[PDB]
Design a binder for this molecule. Structure first.
Ligand SMILES: *[C@@H]1O[C@H](CO)[C@@H](O)[C@H](O)[C@H]1NC(C)=O
Ligand SMILES: *[C@@H]1O[C@H](CO)[C@@H](O)[C@H](O)[C@H]1NC(C)=O
Ligand SMILES: *[C@@H]1O[C@H](CO)[C@@H](O)[C@H](O)[C@H]1NC(C)=O
Ligand SMILES: *[C@@H]1O[C@H](CO)[C@@H](O)[C@H](O)[C@H]1NC(C)=O
Ligand SMILES: *[C@@H]1O[C@H](CO)[C@@H](O)[C@H](O)[C@H]1NC(C)=O
Ligand SMILES: *[C@@H]1O[C@H](CO)[C@@H](O)[C@H](O)[C@H]1NC(C)=O
Ligand SMILES: [Ca+2]
Ligand SMILES: [Ca+2]
Ligand SMILES: [Ca+2]
Ligand SMILES: [Ca+2]
Ligand SMILES: [Ca+2]
Lengths: 323, 478, 388, 98
């Protein structure tokens, strides 16, 4: 293992380092992860109103980045371009999706096209960190220890303990949303119960069960299949998460998006592969090999030829020069 | 339910007495002398009146320990704080009343630690009275002064000059060495111990000076004075908030107006009231650098100093670190940082906590050049953590009054049967010392003093230059 | 203080006077009263003008008379926000063995509770008087040798007169002029670690003693690092230029940055720390005009108007009922209304025509003819005209 | 001024062989940008890089004193209780021994 994983997938949902999901429609900034005795860094997530905007990394006292789904990154208040490499934080793009690596400090954040924060974090912070993605221990039930230190049964007042205000905006306690689903029930639970159910029935998902349990994943979807009107696609966010959560455990799955009728969004020219190498052979590249022994990562990439050049796939014959 | 243990008995709130001081006012050893609030008792089980709780054990007698630094001490056990012993009896710590020997300092370029203990900031560029005795209604024996040049902003600039005026003398020091411009009358009390990194320097029964050859000035006074002095170090009275009594006899609140009262030249430039801020000039709007300096000054709170941090507060000596090495543009010599930590380690040494904080990648301090003048490399010169400053030598064979227990620096160590002399850098057998013993008695190695001024008829003088067993004839007054 | 004065002048500190003669101020050494101060989160001031911080959560002893037992004060601290470096005062408990061995309690509002019973202010018992000050802050006054201040949101004060010189013990110290001995635990020996001093005065054993007092809670909330700099940078700005030479600002700046980064709302934590400085600049003689629409001007109601330096003697309608009483009060700061208008109980302030009377405590209306068989009394314009 | 150690009495022999103007521009560039606080290594390493080039051309140099870039060697003579004192900081000794 030697690593961890958090995920803020879909709308308002969360997945801690230890198999514990919940929902949280925040209103302001909140602490994702970071030390608790002494903080060398702190990953932070800004919510506008329930829906998320930005991931932020405050590197102690002196440095700050604010990337958004947007992607218009900035350092302090000055908007910078991208890529960017200051202070040991390489702010790159991998597989058409944005990354923020901090290997000196022990973390790898990223965001996808739809907007799904992810935090891979080292084993150095085992029983150390505490935040909105919980502590990195083995157990999964105790990982709501508030900023005071209090095992709370509620997954909601917990996340509101880990709020962090600024001078531009001071923020209050968000309220849990009043569900309109409770009256507009109708047929929406009968015909659409299956897209949640196919995590358990279909054979391509029928083999991570000795590694994980889909019972929370099917539990968290059934409450969000009810607000969207007229769509089977409303299940694939909670399903897409289940793919990665099994991949991180050491058992990857293949071709599950072929028949699922939902592919994650990516820009033109590329679509979602599974287990593409991060060292994408691009056009203006040096033909060197066997240094990129990194692990295999999911994300969208170009066709077999069609090398990359400035965020678009272009045929290898038309590789330009630079001066 | 649970029938409580035998050693104690359950209580019940009576319906009549409002003073139901039962379970809520559980008297432990901390809160016995302290007075407690109480609304009503509870359904608890409390110890008898003749005993108290003690860490999940109702200790019977009123013998329970006497805490200090959050540590246990049985009755009869002693603690040594300063030059006093102190024993606990009636649960309260019973000390002595031997006032100890105070110590000024100049921690860095522009700071001053008074006798009673008051760090303050005073960047000056004129000459200033560090401490003296001619204060109000006194004779005026000694007038230690201090003088800085280019030292309002700490840097590789700011060499200090020190002119000390005792017994009608003028001995002064700068640029590493000490110089006598006017020798003083009673040479007997004079003494100079160039041991290690320091220049220890006695001047009398109740006065001593220390100098790290670079900036520090740590004058040590004895119990004799007790409110007879004044200057930038204050009055030495125990009261810690009257060390800003200016020359015009009033307490001030802003130290930058204080030291301006103590300048000698009343027509040089008085220093400027700086706008207060947590960031000095270089660290001003350079928040990146301000963290690299803060972290490196946390060596004062590190695994190697944990023993001393419980005795000596590091928060004074940290504020100096951040202040100096921001302003200091350290380029070749990282001395404006390595000297503020050594000033903390030495204070930790005086309280008996020797420390080895100095490595090869941090403030190295080699000692190999003294083992060079001889072609054969004997290798006796070593950098010791904290070795005694007051040893025996060919020049100072007798033991001296030793204000400083131990000191850092390069120390010569060689097997016994050999004694150190400084001119010939190595250690040498005792007989090679120019030692003097005229007419039998033990004394120093031929001090250049004219003994016996008192009686003319008993004027039996016997000098000794280096070795001679001679005696000189007195010139008669008649 | 960097300015010249001719000879023969007599400038006066708050404590005493000094006169210039032959370039040397002569000065008296007569004692002058002390002030232990709790404020902010956990920021204490001893009687001897020491400053420190101790963020413990128990019932601690603030002060006590320790050769006899004329009184004893007891602070009660609690955590006060999400952070762990935020421990504000909730209540304080006073104990007077001279009167019934009673037990006063100042609650988290402006409320007071004697022996469990809530009380309407004023409370003239024999010795102790408890009354509002601006109608937003309580003031206890036992005898002529003890005062207090509001413990609603945690800004306790005390005034101990020199009759208690050196004969008190607590977190606030000996009151002996020496600033260094104040970390003296009850076992009679000075401690160098503040984390040992405070946890020796706790009254309950179940309370958790702390192991480290942190200095920078802005690390746990890096968002407020920027704001805490520019916010309390006004404290050294020349807005406060007039009282840098009256009291050292450097700690009141140090206590801001610990409050704005720690508390739930840094808006009022800022503007209750800047006032901690102006309230000390004013206690020495310097009043500062530091209120703006941005820098936290309070909102006096429509009946009242803001006022910088005014007289709280001719304000309340109770004053006209008891005019012969002395009002030896200062020139205070708060919400008043113009001199033609006097303060009524219901928040509005009114002219002295409908200003009721308070005869024998009873609140009579502006026209109430009133008589037993023998006496004859009426209320005209605030005063109760009795005869026989 | 402190980077003029590259043009000093102790380097006069090498300045005639190896131009110091390249190695001086590096000195001014590094230790401006470098915020040297505890370790003065961003200065002491640019001069050693010049002294080593001077050594390859046969000009050994001793530029290192106690108040400038000290480089002690006493910790290796510590693991033994008896202080034999064989390790020493030698200006330019052969690297390829037996
Ligand atoms: C998104 O980007 C646009 C254009 O750069 C900017 O105007 C806007 O403030 C951004 N919004 C968010 C939520 O980041
Ligand atoms: C550290 O974690 C272990 C198990 O992961 C737990 O048993 C222990 O109590 C933790 N230590 C602290 C100081 O919380
Ligand atoms: C300390 O002990 C001595 C000797 O037993 C005793 O004379 C003295 O009274 C004690 N001190 C105090 C303060 O009681
Ligand atoms: C330093 O001196 C102490 C006491 O004199 C001695 O015990 C120790 O061995 C010395 N250390 C070194 C490195 O010589
Ligand atoms: C000892 O003193 C005599 C004077 O009486 C002098 O001539 C002689 O040189 C001295 N000897 C030494 C060794 O200094
Ligand atoms: C050590 O230094 C000497 C001169 O100091 C030099 O001759 C020698 O080559 C150096 N190295 C060795 C192995 O002697
Ligand atoms: Ca967990
Ligand atoms: Ca004093
Ligand atoms: Ca000893
Ligand atoms: Ca005191
Ligand atoms: Ca050769």
């Amino acid at each position: 293992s030697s690593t961890a994983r958090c995920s803020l997938f879909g709308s308002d949902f969360v997945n801690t380092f230890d198999g514990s999901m919940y929902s949280f429609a925040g209103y302001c900034s909140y602490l994702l992860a970071g030390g608790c005795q002494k903080r060398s860094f702190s990953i932070i997530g800004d919510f506008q109103n329930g829906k998320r905007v930005s991931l932020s990394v405050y590197l102690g006292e002196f440095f700050d980045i604010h990337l958004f789904v947007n992607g218009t990154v900035t350092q302090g208040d000055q908007r910078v371009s991208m890529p960017y490499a200051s202070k040991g934080l390489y702010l790159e793009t991998e597989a058409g999706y944005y990354k923020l690596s901090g290997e000196a400090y022990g973390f790898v954040a990223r965001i996808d096209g739809s907007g799904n924060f992810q935090v891979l974090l080292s084993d150095r912070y085992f029983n150390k960190t505490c935040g909105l993605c919980g502590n990195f221990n083995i157990f999964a039930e105790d990982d709501f220890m508030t900023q005071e230190g209090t095992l709370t049964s509620d997954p909601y007042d917990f996340a509101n303990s880990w709020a962090l205000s600024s001078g531009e905006q001071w923020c209050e306690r968000a309220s849990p949303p009043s569900s309109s689903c409770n009256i507009s029930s109708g047929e929406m639970q009968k015909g659409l119960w299956e897209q949640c159910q196919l995590l358990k029935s279909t054979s391509v998902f029928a083999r991570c069960h000795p590694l994980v349990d889909p019972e929370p994943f099917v539990a968290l979807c059934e409450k969000t299949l009810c607000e969207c009107a007229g769509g089977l696609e409303c299940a694939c966010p909670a399903l897409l998460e289940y793919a990665r959560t099994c991949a991180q455990e050491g058992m990857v799955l293949y071709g599950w998006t072929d028949h699922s009728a939902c592919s994650p969004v990516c820009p033109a020219g590329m679509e979602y592969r599974q287990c593409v190498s991060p060292c994408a052979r691009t056009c203006q590249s040096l033909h060197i090999n066997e240094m990129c022994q990194e692990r295999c990562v999911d994300g969208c990439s170009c066709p077999e030829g069609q090398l990359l050049d400035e965020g678009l796939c272009v045929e290898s014959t038309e590789c330009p020069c630079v001066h | 339910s649970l029938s409580c243990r035998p050693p104690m008995v359950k209580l019940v709130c009576p319906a009549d007495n409002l003073r139901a001081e039962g379970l809520e006012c559980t008297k432990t050893c901390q809160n016995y002398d302290l007075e407690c609030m109480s609304m009503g008792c509870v359904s608890g089980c409390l110890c008898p009146p003749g005993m108290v709780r003690h860490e999940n054990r109702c200790v019977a007698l009123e013998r329970c320990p006497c805490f200090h630094q959050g540590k246990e001490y049985a009755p009869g056990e002693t603690v040594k704080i300063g030059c006093n012993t102190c024993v606990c009896q009636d649960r309260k710590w019973n000390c002595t009343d031997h006032v100890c020997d105070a110590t000024c300092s100049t921690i860095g370029m522009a700071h001053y630690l008074t006798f009673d203990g008051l760090k303050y900031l005073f960047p000056g560029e004129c000459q200033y009275v560090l401490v003296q005795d001619y204060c109000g209604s006194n004779p005026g024996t000694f007038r230690i002064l201090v003088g800085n040049k280019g030292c309002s902003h700490p840097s590789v600039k700011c060499k200090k000059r020190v002119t000390i005026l005792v017994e009608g003398g003028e001995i002064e020091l700068f640029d590493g060495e000490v110089n006598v411009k006017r020798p003083m009358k009673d040479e007997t009390h004079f003494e100079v111990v160039e041991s290690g990194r320091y220049i220890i320097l006695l001047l009398g029964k109740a006065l001593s000076v220390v100098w790290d050859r670079h900036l520090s000035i740590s004058v040590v006074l004895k119990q004799t004075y007790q409110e007879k002095v004044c200057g930038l170090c204050g009055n030495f009275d125990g009261i810690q908030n009257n060390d800003l009594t200016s020359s015009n006899l009033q307490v001030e609140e802003d130290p930058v107006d204080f030291g301006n009262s103590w300048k000698v030249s009343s027509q040089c430039a008085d220093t400027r009231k700086v706008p207060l801020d947590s960031s000095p000039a270089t660290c001003h709007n350079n928040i990146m650098k301000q963290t690299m300096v803060d972290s490196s000054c946390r060596i004062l709170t590190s695994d190697v100093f944990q023993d001393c941090n419980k005795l000596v507060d590091p928060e004074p000596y940290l504020d100096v670190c951040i202040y100096d090495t921001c302003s200091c543009e350290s380029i070749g010599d990282c001395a404006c940082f390595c000297d503020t930590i050594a000033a903390y380690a030495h204070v930790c040494a005086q309280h008996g906590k020797v420390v080895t904080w100095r490595t090869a990648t941090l403030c190295p301090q080699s000692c190999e050049e003294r083992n060079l003048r001889e072609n054969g490399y004997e290798c006796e010169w070593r950098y010791n953590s904290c070795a005694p400053a007051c040893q025996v030598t060919c020049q100072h064979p007798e033991p001296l009054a030793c204000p400083v227990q131990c000191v850092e620096g390069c120390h010569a160590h060689c097997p016994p049967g050999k004694i150190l002399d400084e001119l010939l850098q190595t250690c040498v057998d005792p007989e090679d010392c120019p030692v003097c013993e005229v007419a039998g008695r033990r004394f120093a190695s031929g001090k250049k003093v004219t003994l016996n001024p008192s009686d003319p008829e008993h004027c039996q003088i016997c000098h000794c230059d280096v070795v001679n067993l001679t005696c000189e004839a007195c010139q008669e007054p008649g | 203080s960097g300015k010249r004065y001719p000879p023969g002048t007599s400038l006066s500190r708050d404590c005493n006077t000094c006169i210039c003669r032959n370039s040397q101020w002569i000065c008296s050494n007569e004692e002058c009263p002390g002030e232990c101060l709790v404020t902010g989160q956990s920021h204490f001031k001893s009687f001897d003008n020491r400053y420190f911080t101790f963020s413990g959560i128990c019932q601690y002893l603030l002060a006590r008379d320790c050769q006899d037992h004329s009184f004893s004060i007891v602070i009660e601290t609690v955590q006060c926000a999400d952070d762990r470096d935020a421990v504000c005062t909730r209540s304080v408990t006073v104990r007077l063995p001279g009167l019934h061995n009673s037990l006063v309690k100042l609650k988290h509002g402006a409320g007071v509770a004697m022996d469990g019973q809530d009380v309407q202010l004023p409370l003239l018992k024999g010795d102790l008087r408890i009354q509002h000050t601006v109608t937003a802050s309580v003031r206890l006054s036992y005898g002529e040798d003890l005062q207090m201040d509001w413990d609603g949101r945690g800004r306790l004060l005390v005034k101990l007169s020199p009759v208690y010189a050196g004969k008190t013990c607590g977190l606030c110290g000996n009151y002996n002029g020496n600033q260094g001995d104040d970390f003296l635990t009850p076992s009679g020996l000075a401690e160098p670690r503040v984390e040992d001093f405070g946890n020796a005065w706790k009254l309950h054993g179940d309370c958790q003693d702390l192991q480290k007092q942190h200095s920078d809670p802005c690390a746990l909330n890096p968002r407020m690092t920027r704001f805490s700099e520019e916010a309390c940078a006004v404290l050294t700005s020349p807005t406060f230029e007039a009282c840098h030479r009256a009291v050292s600002p450097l700690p009141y700046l140090r206590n801001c940055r610990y409050d704005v980064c720690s508390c739930s709302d840094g808006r009022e934590c800022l503007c209750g720390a800047l006032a901690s400085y102006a309230a000390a600049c004013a206690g020495r003689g310097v009043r500062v005009a530091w209120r703006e629409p941005g820098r936290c001007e309070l909102n006096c109601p429509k009946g009242q108007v803001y006022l910088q330096c005014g007289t709280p003697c001719n304000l309340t309608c109770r004053s006209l009922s008891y005019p012969d009483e002395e009002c030896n009060e200062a020139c205070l700061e708060g919400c008043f209304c113009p001199p033609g208008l006097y303060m009524d109980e219901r928040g509005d302030c009114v002219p002295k025509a409908q200003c009721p009377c308070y005869y024998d405590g009873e609140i009579f209306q502006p026209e109430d003819i009133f008589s037993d068989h023998h006496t004859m009394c009426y209320c005209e314009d605030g005063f109760m005209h009795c005869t026989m």
